Amino acid sequence: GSHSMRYFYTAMSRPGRGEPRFIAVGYVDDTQFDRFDSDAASPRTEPRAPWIEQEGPEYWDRNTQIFKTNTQTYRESLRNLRGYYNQSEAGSHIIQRMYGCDLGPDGRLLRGHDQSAYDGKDYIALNEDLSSWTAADTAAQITQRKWEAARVAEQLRAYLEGLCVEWLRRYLENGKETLQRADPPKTHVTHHPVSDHEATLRCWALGFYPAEITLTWQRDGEDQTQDTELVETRPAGDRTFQKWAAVVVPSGEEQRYTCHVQHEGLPKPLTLRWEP
């Protein structure tokens, strides 16, 4: 199937409570595989998936060097942006960055990503051409000018088309027993009377991987989007995910409703009804 790698950086200032914290996490698809936290007792890149543990000392040293350097770089960036927005030294602020590559079913680069945010708002993003930038405001235009002068887009393109894809392919092979395994949802429908007049039908999907899933209720074959309570997909803690969708239906009309489940791990899409 299709796969992706992403790194997620958070840099957060905290005036009066030391220097800004820098944390980096790396993911392949929905699986975290490394972390770095400048607040750790002894900051170093740590493995978070079994298949990465086989990488040699040179790998871990290289990662840690990069993240230690980033810690300093992002502290300078926080100072810069505080200035770009005329902000005082009193408040806490956050820079976030997410970047990485997407691969198609063929294993080739589908597209690359590189986006930054300040205080939860989009700041600057690399365009899909991997050659130009989209700046959100006049502050981000300052960054854009600096990055154009320094050939940053060219640097990102080289990384995204090269090392990013090369290492993602390596991780996918080393972790093939898990990263390339889709676990189908275990499904069931529960029934919960709410009154004499209505009952809740809840369609469950449990233990699936990856997180991508489609869960929908239909009434007489008509989608019930507006009337469905669909909770956010949530992690079980064992790598897998959970989700449910609920509709409140008139008593006695339960059989007019069907739950439909789509997921990569299923031999075929599921159609469920309440089974009294």
Binding site: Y7, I66, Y74, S77, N80, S116, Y159
Partner: peptide
């Protein structure tokens, strides 16, 4: 593996 030589904003 993460991006090297990252430039400041």
């Amino acid at each position: 593996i993460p991006l090297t030589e990252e430039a400041e904003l």
